Symmetry: D3
Subunit: 317 residues, 6 copies
């Protein structure tokens, strides 16, 4: 289990995103749910998986009562996705300076069907991340020493020895997919690179639903340089052959949506235009019928000159 410091978050993201095409599979934004837990006295376990960063001044996180008599506190979380292989994750103890979780370990298990709610007592649990030490009010970026778990997993269990507080818990993993949305996160797609993110993130583009407001989308500052543009490179969770339609949803972007957009395709060198410059409108699902055969592995959305987009869909085989 190698650790990373804020100083090298760049490298950490590289090991996680670019090299292992993984995502925070327990995040609520994508479907993650809290199945159970041992205690939740000062702050709810649900706080652990929210998309927003921890706020202060009540605590934004999971804090249990004091003096646990059990060897550890715990929580069981079900991935939003069908299953995935784990590479690493984050444990943020933000604003918990002292009463933070002293040590933490993670376990996983695979449950064929939604037969019921998993119990912490289940015999299928398996250690995914050996016990390690946490520091106060900080982020712990960690990767498994051997990398991607060779087994598939559906539920994960966080353990805090013996109790305390954790602000956020992120667990990155390679989605094991179930005509389909090739750029859908639940199908294995992930956001790779991007010009910039002001609010929201490029990985919001590959999510379920149209969202609730502009916060769950991808937005970029108001630029001024001529010929300026913004872009996001998504790696479809499965190389295409036939792309029927590409959808660019600007839902909730009413006064800051892009002026034009263009989509391109690349195969694991040259980029090919799939949807040339197209004037876009506010809060709409602009649908582009491609009906073309191409072997693309990556898609690139370009916002011009900048703006906000909620989602991008790429239906095909």
């Amino acid at each position: 289990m190698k650790f990373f410091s804020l100083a090298d978050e760049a490298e950490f993201k590289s090991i996680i995103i670019s090299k292992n095409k993984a995502v925070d599979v327990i995040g609520s934004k994508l479907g993650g749910q809290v199945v159970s837990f041992s205690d939740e006295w000062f702050a709810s376990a649900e706080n652990l998986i929210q998309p927003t960063a921890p706020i202060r001044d009540w605590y934004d996180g999971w804090e249990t009562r004091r003096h646990n008599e059990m060897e550890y506190d715990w929580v069981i979380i079900k991935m939003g996705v069908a299953a995935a292989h784990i590479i690493g994750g984050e444990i943020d103890t933000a604003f918990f300076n002292g009463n933070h979780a002293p040590f933490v370990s993670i376990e996983a298990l695979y449950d064929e069907g939604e037969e019921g709610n998993i119990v912490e007592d289940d015999s299928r649990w398996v250690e995914i991340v050996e016990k390690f030490e946490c520091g106060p009010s900080q982020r712990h970026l960690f990767v498994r020493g051997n990398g991607l778990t060779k087994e598939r997993f559906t539920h994960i269990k966080l353990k805090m020895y013996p109790d305390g507080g954790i602000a956020r818990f992120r667990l990155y993993g390679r989605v094991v997919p179930p005509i389909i949305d090739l750029a859908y996160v639940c199908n294995g797609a992930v956001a790779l690179k991007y010009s910039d993110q002001h609010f929201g993130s490029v990985d919001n583009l590959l999510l379920p639903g149209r969202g609730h407001d502009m916060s769950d989308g991808w937005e970029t500052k108001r630029s001024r340089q001529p010929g300026h543009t913004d872009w996001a490179v998504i790696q479809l969770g499965r190389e295409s052959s036939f792309i029927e339609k590409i959808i660019v949803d600007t839902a909730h972007f009413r006064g800051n949506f892009p002026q034009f957009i263009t989509v391109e395709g690349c195969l694991k060198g040259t980029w090919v235009e799939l949807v040339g410059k197209s004037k876009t409108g506010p809060d709409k699902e602009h649908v582009y019928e491609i009906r073309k055969s191409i072997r693309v592995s990556h898609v690139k959305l370009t916002i011009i000159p900048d703006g906000g987009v909620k989602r991008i869909r790429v239906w095909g085989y």
Copy 2:
């Protein structure tokens, strides 16, 4: 399709709950999620499936802009449940007087796996409920003339002609079963009878997770006469042959948790499965049975009253 007036809700349930063994398969509490919609100008589409009763003042409901160019507005909702057969539902237009939905019609569709977010266009959409008329600020309890739909669906589509507002949308259906939690709502269990429901319904007993607070559970009024007790009759999604674990969870109930609880089983005459046991607060109570019985309906008894969050029943057959 028959409609029921408020003074007939008693019979309405009879049709959907006792007879058809249905439950609200699109509500959030259970996993219902908005996939998309044509517009949400004045009020968010997600409000539709909330578990709370509409609240006044912003509008606690769904509302599109005026003068729709298309023939109707729509919202696409994915079932929380794995699949279900439909019988009817509720369309509450609360607090929308005049600008309420003139007409509504419902369509269902069956999609195998989360390939992506279904589109209005999809040629699999079929009419499940013929277009009927809505009135100002009221509830519309309806049931399909032909009872349950022979087919089973995973997503439903609501159509409002041509635009306006709907406060709530409940769609009732019989869940299709995917050791298993035999009382778990996802496996087809439903609550038929209850002695009392002061706060939170009895159908909360059979849901995923442990919830957020006392509101997603079952709570009865405070009683005074000796020997008084409250109960909930639950129909297992399948008859049992063997039962290993029964779990009564009082999570979140700290000052009003029941004093003692018992669990009796029946085949449709009652047999004791769990003898009178003193319960505690915000705790999971695990009772080992290791016995074999052919019970179909279970009955939780809390004494003298109080609240319980969940009841699990692990068995076979």
Copy 3:
């Protein structure tokens, strides 16, 4: 001086609106401003001229301290309009039960230019409305027996004997006209008829600026029958001889702006000045006429309903 009961508001308007062509010349919405007052101990004098109806709970009104040493309390208000002849007004004592104004009397005055803030002392103050009696928590609609005052004024003074509270003070008067906006309230135009007023009155159509939000405009209920339309009949401050520009402004109406609008002219039989045109949201619609017509009353028609912020009509004569 005659008074009208609520069940007579219908006739009240007839007298002031249709007959005398008056408008509330001291309200803030139109430019009314408090110049000074003798006291505002419990509630601000500025509340008097607000466009909203009194709201309960602080007191939404004007209230002076108890036991006034002088004979009466007073407030001096300057007309928004350039000058006007008075017919009557409203004195709403809403929510002031018992400590309401026992008596009230009104005085007017004509001051050329903004030399400074007029004083109570000024020897130009003349009685326009004889001292009458007010009752607890109610509205007092009154009209001068001698109709319009032969003279024209710029400031008015309200006297409360000897102290107490008044929720609202409306003073109706016929504006004195200073290419010109012939429908502009400052030039003497007034709205006589309207098919409907769900939110915001039709007299908002003829005001300065584009307003703040949807509240300072005209909005009609959402309609359902085909071919339904809503309208507003406006009397120009002067008959036209030539009309160059007509402008329909829907500023702030983004989801309920009208679909199409038309403008007909009449001389007091209607003539089309602006043919059916599709309108947009939060936009100014400029229609060139370059024609000559002797119209006195204009009529805006929005289809099928919705809201409009302003209507301008530039002409001659």
Copy 4:
């Protein structure tokens, strides 16, 4: 067009106030109004002219949608005063770091009478301040290269190429006046110098109305030094000959109003007492009958030992 930095605001105020006797003639505090504008999506154009300084955390200013297709956005503001000559002004882009207006130019025009609402299209518009560049989150103090415009103006137009945000817009100008209030701002009077201002400003003394609270008055910290005093030198908008009465209004100053006051007069060298030490009371209009003939150009109010005053009036010829 010479610019000034916060470092030399002192000199800027000198060029504007002392040398050109000008005031912020479009300020709402004095009567400035927003007539129209091109867009107002993120923040209202009315925010531009409010008396208070820009606050943060919604934006306190004027921000338009993105990617304007028109060459520039704009707003038309009507001065509170009858007319004035312009010398300069301020453009604050506070808290707009990046999305601020890249460039700005100002235009003016004179409209004989309130014939209607001016259109940005009017042919009378005249460039008053050539296009210049703005920086992020900062104040831009600017003066016209040639100084006071030889022409009179009533409306001014701010243009933002092509869109963005401006926090505040101040436009200083010499008021062209219409027995009168010689110290009335609408008559050309201006606050020249002053010992100090804690809350509110000395220029609040020459405003219309009695105000709403202590914020629109002039207040000084609680001093302790013996024989300490505070003063404000106003320059009447017109040399006097006969001063009938001087009014000192302490409206809204109930616990921090001055203990004594004295008024003096000077002619453009020696100061002459007009109202000697006079014990003052709370929330009152202390009226001093002078009935004296004097050629004063400047008036000086002295607060002892300190305190709060709402307004000072000086009636005469």
Copy 5:
């Protein structure tokens, strides 16, 4: 023990106020303080003695958890007063419907000095009020059949059988007198009659300190007929022989303080002690008498109405 219905409150007071000369000796306003309690799970025990009437929504009252193992829940309250004899009180179960206190009983105890906080256990606790039954959301005005208790107490104990909620608990008793303030509540004075009580009762006149705001005083409605006056008849804790100072305190009454006040004395025919004097706001009015009179009941007269905070009367005997 007799109970009185609301339509009998008139008689209730007669018994406790005029006859027995009692006052609410446990309310906070007067010094009542919670010493301890068995439980406060859903609602704080301190709410019981608040001077305000119960307010809805949290619960404005006292509420213990469900299923008490002991026979009853309890709260221990220490009298503000030095000691008192009990006659009866009020038990308001407002807003507690069903989960209200089934039964209640009261016990008193006399402890010399503040040795510590009394315990439920203490063998000095004696029954003062036999266990009676309470109903849902209502007031219970009761009086002891045997009138005043022969003994005097310092602390009282409320017992709720077995658990539930009580909104308010008033306990009436005749205070035991420890130059002295002869009208001071702690010396046994009580208010018998008043002409009017619009805001705040007359018994506030005789309390410790000057209070917090206008709410802890006596305020009468605004009157209109000439010569109208309001009064309060107060019974001194002892007859006077000599009276040196009378003090009328209008602290906090700034805009509704009385205009003039007078004070007459009587022996139980009235004699003037303080002649008509003009009163001021938020000020203490000290009137020297230096005379000897055998008065027992004093009478404060405010003209024409208004509010007064306190009335002190220093004398001998």
Copy 6:
């Protein structure tokens, strides 16, 4: 009168607490009340004695109107305790930077019985702390040059020459006590030393009542070191001989109450166990019957491994 700086607060506390066994006898937390005052215009005199530290952004303190004509402003405060000897105190002018009280002096007086409310005019007042200078926004720790006043006192009077603001006023004094609670503050007990205080203070343990929430108790951070503990040494206000029972109340500490506690006794050298390790529960009054004879002067409560306690009682002779 020697002063102390924040730098030597440690020494100041030593002179006050350890050497003179004194406490803040006018604090509201212990019973202190405001009897009267000269003015309270900007901020209530009651703010002076609240237990919490001064907050900002209305002012948290006592601020009077400006320009007092009287030689000084003042306030009369009654100690919560029966009487005490004074050693020193604190005057905090927090957040009052400039308008703070320039000078201050303190007076005291003894009133046999609660005969009435003391007047600032009383002849018994005695100078306890000669007039001294205060600085802006700071704490003034001061001790009487000669120390403990040889006389007993019940009321104290703060004087501010001539007016301004004081944030807090603390007056430490040795309590003159009235089977009893030997560790009760009202009996002369005081908190001496302690391992640490996170929230609340160790001196909260010796207070009246059970409190309102966790803020009026003694709590320590969540520790992690093995064998870690927390303790508080109380000095009984009177050496014991027979200790009947010791009570440890953990009221309001539900999730952070200690796991075990032990009480010890010492005589003015060796510590003796009085209550050995005892598992403690939440929100309960753990009662320990000692029924032992011992000459202890000091008591020591030990929290293990840490936690929160509301009060400790020690009944005996």
